[PDB]
From Swiss-Prot:
GO biological process: cell redox homeostasis
Site (Deprotonates C-terminal active site Cys): 26
This protein's name: Thioredoxin 1
Disulfide bonding pattern of the chain: 32-35
Positions where N6-acetyllysine occurs in the chain: 69
Gene name of the encoded protein: trxA
Assembly and oligomerization: Monomer. Interacts with bacteriophage T3 DNA polymerase.
Active site: 32, 35
Purpose: Participates in various redox reactions through the reversible oxidation of its active center dithiol to a disulfide and catalyzes dithiol-disulfide exchange reactions.
GO CC terms: cytoplasm; cytosol
Domain Thioredoxin: 1-108
NCBIfam families: PRK09381.1 (NF006898), thioredoxin (TIGR01068)
Amino acid sequence: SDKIIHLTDDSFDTDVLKADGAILVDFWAEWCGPCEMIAPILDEIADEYQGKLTVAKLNIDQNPGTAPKYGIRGIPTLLLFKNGEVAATKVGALSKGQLKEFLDANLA
Ligand SMILES: [Cu+2]
């Protein structure tokens, strides 16, 4: 938790679109089993990728406006942002191994 950014629809532009460096955004919602599976995986990734990546989370039941703008369908959906643009997309729950391979491939 501590270094992971809790996003709102208000702050999304400043925190993600204007941020320097890669930001991985987790679009999640309440009552979501797959969302709960990857939540400790992302607290680990936040520590292991420190200096290379910032992790941020946006709960769509409390923040209904940003996800329609990115065409989000399945929840959870992870979007890797770089310089304000969507660099890569992964949707669905995945293991720690799969997430590391996805990040190592795309942080290049
Ligand atoms: Cu922490």
